[PDB]
Design a protein around this nucleic acid. Sequence first.
DNA 1: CGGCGTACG
DNA 2: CGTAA
DNA 3: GCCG
Length: 326
Amino acid sequence: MPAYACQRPTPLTHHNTGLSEALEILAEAAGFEGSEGRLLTFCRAASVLKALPSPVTTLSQLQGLPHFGEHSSRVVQELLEHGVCEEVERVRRSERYQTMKLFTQIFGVGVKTADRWYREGLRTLDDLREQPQKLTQQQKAGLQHHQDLSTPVLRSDVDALQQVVEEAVGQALPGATVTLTGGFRRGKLQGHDVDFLITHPKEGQEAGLLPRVMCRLQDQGLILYHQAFERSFCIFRLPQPGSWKAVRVDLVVAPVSQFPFALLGWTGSKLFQRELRRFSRKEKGLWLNSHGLFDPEQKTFFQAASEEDIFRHLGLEYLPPEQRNA
DNA sequence: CGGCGTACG
DNA sequence: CGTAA
DNA sequence: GCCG
Ligand SMILES: [Cl-]
Ligand SMILES: [Cl-]
Ligand SMILES: [Cl-]
Ligand SMILES: [Mg+2]
Ligand SMILES: [Mn+2]
Ligand code: NA
């Protein structure tokens, strides 16, 4: 078992679901306290279990696995022996965990804002609605639409949204393409938003595209919320039988020269990409982002025509999107 | 012990 | 500060 | 919290 998530296939469904979910609770709780190192270790330990070929049944099977030390092993031991880990259950029922989770789930609210509200004594969404002076326009939209945004986005919703986005993109710039990214490209059947990556086969023609796309979607009445730019974090109006629902949609534009890097980055998972960028820099001395891959010694950028190119330039076996579910 | 991804709005 | 994978 |  290699130490970095980008070195091993991680399927969407696996054989250690309960164990990984418990470790991810502790990772999430660490993030709510600003403990980014412990968040990473618990996320990585969870991801290792996702990559295993069969269930962990005995504590000895953790021997030699990367990112399992005293603490993560004790969590697993307790789950194996008792079906529950006292620390995990204590986190789950804690007022701090439940409120930070509730607040950070709001679009426009991060850990720092949620924590300040928590310290001020706020605990519920109606507490926030009662004092709208302390809310940004973004947070107001996130709170108004919070119920719909808490409802899973289905693969059926995705096809309908993609046709609508393609219509606007085609008028904004004939020839431009729309690619489904994020968790749905990794094979997820549900999500909390839909991610699209837009480009054009003629380098440079994509400049200034996203404002033109957004204006057209807005004129169709499809935009419930949005803020020169190349990423848009929108709330869309999605038809439903006899009604509609709000759905988060992310639109991103990249020039075709960068498209493989943007596709790789926006396909995720989030942990997979952090691990890939960490691997690139620490193991290969190369600097990776969603625009390119930089050699800081030669001061040169690697040209890539495909995701396969990028895995090759990093010395990694190719993983299709369905095996990037770290 | 230092390090822990790297961008854009 | 928020957002993104 | 764990790795190197
Ligand atoms: Cl930490
Ligand atoms: Cl409607
Ligand atoms: Cl980036
Ligand atoms: Mg997504
Ligand atoms: Mn998204
Ligand atoms: Na949030």
